[PDB]
Amino acid sequence: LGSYGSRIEREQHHLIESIEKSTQYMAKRRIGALISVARDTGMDDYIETGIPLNAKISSQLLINIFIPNTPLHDGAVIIKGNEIASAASYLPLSDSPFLSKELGTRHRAALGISEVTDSITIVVSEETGGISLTKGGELFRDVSEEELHKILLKELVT
Amino acid sequence: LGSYGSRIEREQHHLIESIEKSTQYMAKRRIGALISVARDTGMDDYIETGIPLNAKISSQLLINIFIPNTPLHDGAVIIKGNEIASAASYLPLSDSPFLSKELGTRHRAALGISEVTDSITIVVSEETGGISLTKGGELFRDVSEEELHKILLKELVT
Numbered sequence A, B: 001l002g003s004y005g006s007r008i009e010r011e012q013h014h015l016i017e018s019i020e021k022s023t024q025y026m027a028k029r030r031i032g033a034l035i036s037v038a039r040d041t042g043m044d045d046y047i048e049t050g051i052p053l054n055a056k057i058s059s060q061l062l063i064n065i066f067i068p069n070t071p072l073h074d075g076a077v078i079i080k081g082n083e084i085a086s087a088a089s090y091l092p093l094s095d096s097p098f099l100s101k102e103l104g105t106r107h108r109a110a111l112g113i114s115e116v117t118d119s120i121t122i123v124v125s126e127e128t129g130g131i132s133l134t135k136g137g138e139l140f141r142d143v144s145e146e147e148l149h150k151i152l153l154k155e156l157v158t
């Protein structure tokens, strides 16, 4: 609880900064990433699919998880509460015919989880390095640093 | 219809040889591939998800489709009748808790389609180069050239 109105407000700003730094690092290096931040819905069903970490949130841990050809890189990192709950979780795929065919199953899975939960999911493309975000069944494609920070600030701080 | 009891028997042996040559090429080069061969069930639902090719079957076309960072590489090639019906189709993911966590969503999707259709699906891993096969909800992992030919001969010729 430093310089913020609560411990919780501080932890949420730490979560935002960890997501920003990690995606920035992984985007430059064309590293695929899938980070889904649970909110009100509760995502215990999909945490059980992956490998449980229950680890403190940091930009460095988020990077090491998605390094290619490593035991944790294929799947989704799910953040629940104030910790990284699991890695290598699989998400439901959206059946939307409106998803661009330029986007692979990683983008299609992030859309799938946004349709059935009120979570925020962040995607970094292996092909292009573009950062994308899904919420409420809607995808924002190739967002900027400024645009991403505005969405995370709006949707992840309470 | 050459040296075989029918045109159909010849086309099925051509299909087997095309699958063998392509997976052999892609396995050596660590190229991810997902080829699903429809049988009695009929897979028109999942062909509509991908990009329609309706192309003659060849080992060379199968290779060019899965080259990384190309418009057709992410997704599943579906073979229906005597042609490659579509590329970049997405398959349902199996919810089996018995799938090894070493295997990613590509292997999990091949298991998903084998549970709801009587098709044969072939997988080549980007991580390891191992060739795997799914049928009837069962996965054969890191099969050999001899083992793969025995399964395709049994399950794909009539």
Ligand SMILES: [Co+2]
Binding pocket: A069, A074, B104, B126, B127
């Ligand atoms: Co992978």
Ligand SMILES: [Co+2]
Binding pocket: A104, A126, A127, B069, B074
């Ligand atoms: Co890809």
